Design a protein around this nucleic acid. Structure first.
Lengths: 102, 144, 26, 119, 98, 197, 50, 51, 50, 127, 151, 168
RNA sequence: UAGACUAGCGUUGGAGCACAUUGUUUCAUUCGAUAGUCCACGCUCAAUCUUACCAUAC
RNA sequence: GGAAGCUGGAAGACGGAAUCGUUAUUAAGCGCCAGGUAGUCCUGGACACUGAAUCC
RNA sequence: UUUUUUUUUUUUUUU
RNA sequence: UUCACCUAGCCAACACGAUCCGGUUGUUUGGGAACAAUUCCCUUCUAGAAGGGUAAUCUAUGUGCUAC
RNA sequence: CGUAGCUGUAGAUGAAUGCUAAUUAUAGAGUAU
RNA sequence: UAUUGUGUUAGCAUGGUUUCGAGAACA
RNA sequence: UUUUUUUUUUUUUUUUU
């Protein structure tokens, strides 16, 4: 019929939510170290509830040509189908991709 | 013992991504794949508008030159052609101004590049009967 | 390291670094 | 066959001394500093005097004393499961040597000032 | 002193993602030589740096119990050159980049 | 079939007056702004008082024992306005710079190496392209017996090769090439000042 | 002359609704009301663009 | 902070518009001169003072 | 085929091979060396130096 | 190589050769720093000049140890931004789980006081 | 030394380079250098001496913050802008706390070297009792569909 | 799929007075809309206290050793009242509390006797607000400079590479 | 002329994940049925987010 | 959730029957890490050494 | 090497 | 890159898409089971002592028993 | 690197490794016996 | 440098891409 | 290696004043 236009992903509420946490953590990244420094100097271990909603671990891998949050690698940043379509459309040849080898 | 046939085995299964000479490729493709669609949709459209009004096209350009520089440096008599308009498009890729004297874009002093009106070697060459995505404006139809 | 193969590897690895770990069971 | 130190007879847990001839593992380092606490406290010149009870020789051999020594010694040789390949643990004697020399702890063999070294 | 300095050596390295692209560079570099003012042009030495490769893994169609796999090989090429007694900096740096 | 049966709005009683009148609680979207310094300090005082109230844990007493150990050895900032001078600024003040290109600063051979990336216009900068190091042979450098030993002791055996007899000094604490290059030249001169003593 | 660029995925979707607007039968009043404010005007001729 | 930001696709509603009004202005100003001579002007009208 | 062989045609021409060894020195040649000695009285640019 | 026969005969070059001590330079920096940052330098000014918690009325506020009360409780609470200023009335014991905020909330309590007084009697007092 | 009254020092300023800067073509063509970036463009290398203007009066807190200045300025990974903000907010949070002479006394008395038989303070804290079902308490005042009472 | 926090499965700070949060015969709230915080409502109170005097010799010795000591042990109280309920004295007394608008959480409760005392002290508490207003102006000047910032170096900055220096 | 035979060798217990009977206001919608798009399914990793579910309310 | 000290009388020497298949650097054993963007498996992917027999 | 050593072996490299 | 060639032997939860349906279609704070006999003793308190219970069935995988 | 070769012990009728008053490490938070 | 609803009935018996299971490629 | 811009409780989020 007509394979998707891989440059512009469709709408996804969950996909957009993941990117929202990235901006919050970047601005609050400085405050994270201050909370650990004060406790270390005083010699007392305590929780940091404020880091729950702006923590680095809240963000996880997601598919750009997708919206699933599983089966995404750090090298390709795509799902099983995302890589297949990209490789079969003739776009990785310039980037040194020879499918002849197993 | 095959030495050349087994080259690169060490840096395939016993090496870290951050501790190897391999560079990422997704970063470059991010800004390259998007720009292809921009030139395709806006390519024919820009040329159609330029050719919409054949005559009287050079009058607007001549008057504009009298405001920027005042004196028309490229002035010519009525018996000589002024210029040929070439359909160009803006640059969207955020390239870095490198100090390479042999580069083709490092010495760019404008935000417009020429567009090829005809190409015989399509860059997005398919490996089979599959078509290019986003190249079917008209919706499909079924026999029903 | 749940099985006896991977778990015993940690104890043997430390033995080559200048430490003595009891071995015996598991 | 099953020697300690491997083929190259590695030793990443012992520290040598410039004076005399005596070496000990990091395990005994914790006990030595705690036992010789009276000399260290008087050298500098309640919250400060908190580890006084731990100076007892018999208390260290009891159940309570055994747990205190193990708490301080975190077993640096043990680490995460992903620390494999080039990311292998190194000798932690660099940190131990600094503390042992700065605290000015006497050597059991001969009473001397900071004379310890990595080895 | 700045005026007392001299370029002892200039190690030039390349990184090409295709076999044909790397071959074109060798021919282009050779053509730039044999054209300088001195009788003998600068002739750098060759030093190949192997060919690293990478190929991730992924399960293969969805809704399967991992019966088949599909790999994507991504080869690479490298090349290194050595220089000694680079008296002319303009005739060497420009040629390598060009 | 399923997941379609709607429900009427049962929230219509007059008792529920405090509804749809004020903005909901703080949302994750509004958390983009940073926390002011006044609020960060408040949380420390509230939490420290709760732990001492009786909220203890098995893994809390062990942390305190480790901290007390560093006090005896003398690795704590505990004492039984100020305007100090940073170490970086101190080195800048004490530096004999050359007066023009024709004056030799150093009095010994030295080689400077640095990697420069060149290629097509890349959308992103390549990291690990700002290294600068200096190498020199101890044998060529004429020095006394006492001075020679101190040179290798300060840098240690890691930066010294026993085969050829050369010392390599590497400095990379800046992202920029120009900033890093100047830093190496300052520390190098300071080393010779203390060696000759 | 102005020509605003639009997402290629939106171009095909626009024609899909317009094709069946005056040709086929569309059920539901909400679909026609909401569908008459996004594809009824050209992207370049719109008064406001996101 | 800067590592996690490098994800997903960039914005699409911030591209340069293909406006005909701006096209003519760019062509008219393309043939402008370069009367900078920042260095030459300083040296000029200086030799006479020394003489 | 002729379209793909355009690059080889320019390389084979001997006229272009003469100007290959004549270009501007990259800025990142002598600038790093100048900072090593710690001199604040030299400008790489020729126009600015004058 | 440095020639000392020229610097001694000229004062302009002598200054460059001379390296002022850090003590002299540090003295000037203190004056310049204070002049630029004239509106900064003090952070915690609610030091014991007024003792924290409260100073107007202290002791026997809410400690449920005896019948009836003796005095009220009033003090100030620092805002989350450190610029605003509001009073406080509620004080249970040190922690103050409940805060009555400024007099805006206390005003409504007086208006509603007679209403609750007449309701509690007929609510469960008689049962 | 007189080149800048706000920074009395011998060597502070360097020389500017001729390295091209900017984007070839994008929505940010007219950007050049930032307000803070221009400062480092005319300096030999960045420092961390400007932040040190006022420090906590307490000796314990003064040394804790002072040590961080010497290490941060000689570390790779932190941006110039982040370094200033990291220390600027650190001096304020420390000043809004009780003196260290009192913090240690409270912690030492409340945390003895040896534990006891009842120092945990957590008893009968089962998992499948309170917050694992049993359909019981609702923390809610206004409830039309009373589930607790219906059952 | 385990729980996030284990603190919710433990008893927090004692409320002194125990009141049943779920109402059965509560009236309708009034006002407290613009503020949208700390709503006012009436409920039923239930006071409870423990006086360790009637305990046996066996249990009294252990109880006192935990309560009157250097540190608290086992919360300084016995387990559930399996056999001590005989000495437990509780008196029913109507009381009231406050709850959050959206959060719907209990803050605290007050006895009926204490409520009447507040009315009698209205004249005494009203005049106390005047003293706070006096210090409002004094604290404004001191709390405004509570912002540490780095000294500005740029000074609308020069280009001081070598030239300009005669321009200065 | 494969399986059938000739060597080696893993099992009727105790343990990890998962399907199912029995609990659930929520315990993840599901594939395939007997030589398998069935048990780490699109779980290349679930201690918050990933999570679609229920409760609560804006 | 992973590992470790101490402590140790958790359920097993049943069956030479029967069902899953290997085209030899196959089979049988043993040892190591690369990715899964803090830890986090006995499965999957991937490398190396000892390496027998039969009528297939 | 009759003043010499005092010993097991890996999965990229002396281009 | 057997892009090939038949399919009574596929997902609507990666995505596009024919038709029906339209849950302020999102968000704040929580939960998402397999393991009860309480700090049990008139012998004791600023150096260690006495009690902890669901026995219901399958598939696929690590680890063990061998000589009188 | 592991079973090494070599070489001491008991030429194991008794080597099964799960249960747990209790600590090691990552993490903002994995707690109670 | 985020921006055009629905992770809902309906795929073996009308479906585009991919693929498991059986069969075939010679003159 | 160089030490300071101003400042009132036992009641430092545990005591019947």
């Amino acid at each position: 019929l007509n394979p998707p236009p891989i440059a512009f992903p469709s709408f996804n509420r969950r996909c957009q939510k993941d990117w929202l946490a990235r901006r919050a953590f970047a601005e609050n990244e400085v405050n994270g170290r201050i909370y650990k420094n004060v406790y270390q100097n005083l010699g007392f271990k305590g929780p940091i509830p404020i880091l729950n909603k702006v923590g680095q671990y809240r963000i996880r891998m997601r598919c750009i040509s997708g919206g699933y949050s599983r089966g995404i690698f750090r090298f390709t940043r795509m799902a099983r189908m995302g890589m297949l379509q990209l490789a079969r459309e003739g776009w990785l040849k310039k980037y040194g991709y020879r499918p002849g080898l197993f | 013992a095959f030495r050349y046939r087994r080259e690169g085995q060490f840096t395939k299964f016993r090496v870290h991504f951050d501790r190897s000479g391999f560079r990422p490729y997704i970063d470059e493709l991010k800004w390259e794949i998007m720009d292809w669609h921009y030139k395709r949709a806006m390519g024919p459209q820009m040329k159609k508008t330029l050719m919409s009004y054949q005559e009287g096209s050079e009058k607007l350009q001549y008057m504009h030159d009298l405001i920027a520089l005042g004196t028309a440096k490229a002035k010519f008599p009525h018996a000589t052609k002024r210029f040929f308009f070439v359909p160009a498009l803006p640059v969207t890729i955020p390239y870095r101004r490198s100090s390479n004297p042999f580069c083709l874009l490092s010495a760019n002093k404008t935000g417009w590049l020429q567009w090829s009106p005809k190409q015989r070697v399509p860059f997005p060459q398919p490996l089979g009967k599959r078509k290019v995505g986003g190249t079917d404006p008209q919706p499909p139809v079924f026999p029903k | 390291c749940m099985n006896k193969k991977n778990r015993l590897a940690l104890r043997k690895r430390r033995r080559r670094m200048g430490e003595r770990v009891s071995l015996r069971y598991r | 066959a099953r020697r300690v130190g491997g083929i190259g007879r590695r030793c990443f847990l012992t520290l040598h001394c410039s004076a005399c001839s005596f070496f000990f593992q990091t395990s005994d380092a914790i006990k030595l500093i705690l036992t010789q606490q009276h000399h260290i406290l008087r050298k500098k010149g309640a919250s400060k005097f908190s580890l006084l009870p731990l100076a007892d020789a018999s208390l260290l051999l009891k159940r309570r004393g055994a747990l205190v020594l193990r708490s301080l010694h975190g077993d640096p040789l043990v680490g995460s499961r992903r620390q494999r390949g080039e990311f292998a643990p190194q000798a932690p004697t660099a940190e131990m040597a600094k503390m042992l020399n700065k605290s000015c702890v006497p050597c059991p063999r001969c009473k001397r000032e900071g004379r310890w070294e990595e080895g | 002193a700045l005026s007392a300095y001299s370029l002892r050596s200039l190690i030039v390295t390349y990184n090409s993602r295709n076999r044909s692209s790397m071959n074109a560079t060798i021919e282009n570099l050779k053509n730039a030589l044999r054209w300088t003012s001195p009788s003998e042009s600068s002739s750098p030495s060759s030093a190949p740096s192997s060919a690293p490769s990478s190929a991730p893994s992924s399960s293969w169609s969805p809704f399967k119990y991992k019966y088949a796999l599909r790999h994507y090989v991504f080869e690479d090429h490298r090349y290194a050159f050595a220089f000694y007694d680079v008296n002319s900096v303009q005739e060497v740096v420009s040629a390598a980049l060009g | 079939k399923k997941k379609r049966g709607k429900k009427e709005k049962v929230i219509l009683n007059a008792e529920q007056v405090a509804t749809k009148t004020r903005l909901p609680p703080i949302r994750l979207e509004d958390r983009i702004t940073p926390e002011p310094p006044a609020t960060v300090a408040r949380n420390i005082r509230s939490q420290i008082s709760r732990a001492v109230a009786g909220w203890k844990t098995k893994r809390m007493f062990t942390y305190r024992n480790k901290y007390r150990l560093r006090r005896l050895v003398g690795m704590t900032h505990d004492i039984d306005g100020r305007t100090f001078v940073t170490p970086l600024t101190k080195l800048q003040h004490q530096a004999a710079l050359p007066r023009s290109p024709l004056h030799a600063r150093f009095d010994f051979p030295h080689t400077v190496h640095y990697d420069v990336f060149w290629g097509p216009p890349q959308v992103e900068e390549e990291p690990n392209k700002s290294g600068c190091w200096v190498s020199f042979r101890v044998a060529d450098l004429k020095l006394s017996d006492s001075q020679e030993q101190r040179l290798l002791d300060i840098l240690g055996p890691e930066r010294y090769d026993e085969q050829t007899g050369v010392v390599c000094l590497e400095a990379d604490v800046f992202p920029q090439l120009n900033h890093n290059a100047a830093y190496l030249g300052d520390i190098l001169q300071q080393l010779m000042r203390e060696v000759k003593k | 002359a102005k020509h605003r660029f639009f997402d290629p995925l939106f171009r095909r979707r626009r024609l899909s609704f317009l094709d069946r607007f005056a040709r086929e039968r569309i059920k539901g009043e909400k679909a026609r009301q909401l569908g008459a404010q996004l594809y009824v005007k050209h992207p370049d001729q719109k008064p406001v663009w996101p | 902070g800067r590592q996690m930001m490098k994800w997903y696709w960039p914005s699409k509603y911030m591209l340069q518009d293909v406006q005909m009004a701006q096209y003519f202005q760019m062509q008219a100003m393309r043939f402008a001169p370069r009367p900078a001579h920042v260095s030459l002007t300083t040296l000029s009208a200086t030799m006479e003072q020394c003489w | 085929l002729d379209e793909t062989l355009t690059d080889t045609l320019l390389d084979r021409r001997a006229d272009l091979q003469r100007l290959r060894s004549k270009a501007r020195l990259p800025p990142e040649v002598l600038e790093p060396l100048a900072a090593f000695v710690g001199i604040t009285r030299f400008s790489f640019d020729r126009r600015a130096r004058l | 190589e440095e020639d000392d026969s020229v610097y001694r005969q000229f004062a302009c070059m002598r200054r460059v050769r001379e390296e002022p001590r850090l003590r002299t330079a540090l003295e000037s920096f203190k004056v310049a720093s204070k002049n630029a940052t004239k509106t900064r330098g003090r952070a915690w000014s609610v030091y014991e000049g007024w003792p924290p918690r409260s100073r107007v009325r202290v002791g026997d506020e809410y400690s449920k140890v005896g019948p009836l009360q003796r005095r009220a409780f009033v003090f100030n609470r620092v805002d989350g931004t450190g610029r605003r200023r509001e009073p406080t009335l509620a004080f249970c014991c040190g922690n103050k789980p409940v805060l009555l905020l400024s007099e805006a909330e206390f005003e409504a309590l007086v208006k509603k006081l007679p209403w609750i007084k007449h309701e509690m009697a007929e609510f469960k007092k008689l049962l | 030394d007189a080149l800048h009254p706000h920074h009395p020092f011998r060597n502070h300023f360097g020389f500017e380079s001729s390295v091209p800067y900017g984007v070839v073509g994008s929505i940010s063509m007219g950007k050049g250098r930032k307000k803070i970036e221009k400062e480092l463009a005319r300096l030999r290398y960045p420092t961390l001496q400007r932040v040190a203007h006022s420090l906590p009066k307490d000796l314990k807190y003064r040394e804790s913050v002072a040590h961080a200045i010497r290490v941060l300025e000689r570390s790779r990974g932190w941006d110039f802008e982040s370094k200033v903000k990291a220390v600027n907010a650190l001096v304020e949070v420390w000043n809004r706390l009780a003196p260290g002479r009192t913090y240690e006394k409270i912690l030492n008395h409340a945390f003895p070297v040896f534990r006891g038989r009842g120092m945990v303070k957590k008893t009968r804290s089962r998992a499948a009792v309170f917050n694992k079902g049993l359909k019981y308490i609702r923390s809610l005042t206004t409830q039309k569909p009373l589930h607790a009472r219906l059952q | 799929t385990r729980g996030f926090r284990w603190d919710l499965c433990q008893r927090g700070r004692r409320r002194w007075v125990h009141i049943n949060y779920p109402p059965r015969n509560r009236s309708t709230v009034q006002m407290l809309d613009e503020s949208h915080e700390k709503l006012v409502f009436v409920c039923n109170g239930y006071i409870d206290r423990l006086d360790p005097r009637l305990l046996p010799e066996r249990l009294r010795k252990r109880l006192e050793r935990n309560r009157k000591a250097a540190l608290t042990r086992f919360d300084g109280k016995l387990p559930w009242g399996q056999a001590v309920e005989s000495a437990i004295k509780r008196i029913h007394t109507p009381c009231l509390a406050f709850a959050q608008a959206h959060s719907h959480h209990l803050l605290e409760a007050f006895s009926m006797a204490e409520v009447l005392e507040i009315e009698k002290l209205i004249p005494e508490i009203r005049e106390a607000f005047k003293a706070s207003k006096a210090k409002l102006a004094e604290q404004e000047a001191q709390d405004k400079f509570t912002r540490h910032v780095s000294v500005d170096l740029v000074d609308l900055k020069e280009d001081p590479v070598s030239f300009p220096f005669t321009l200065k």
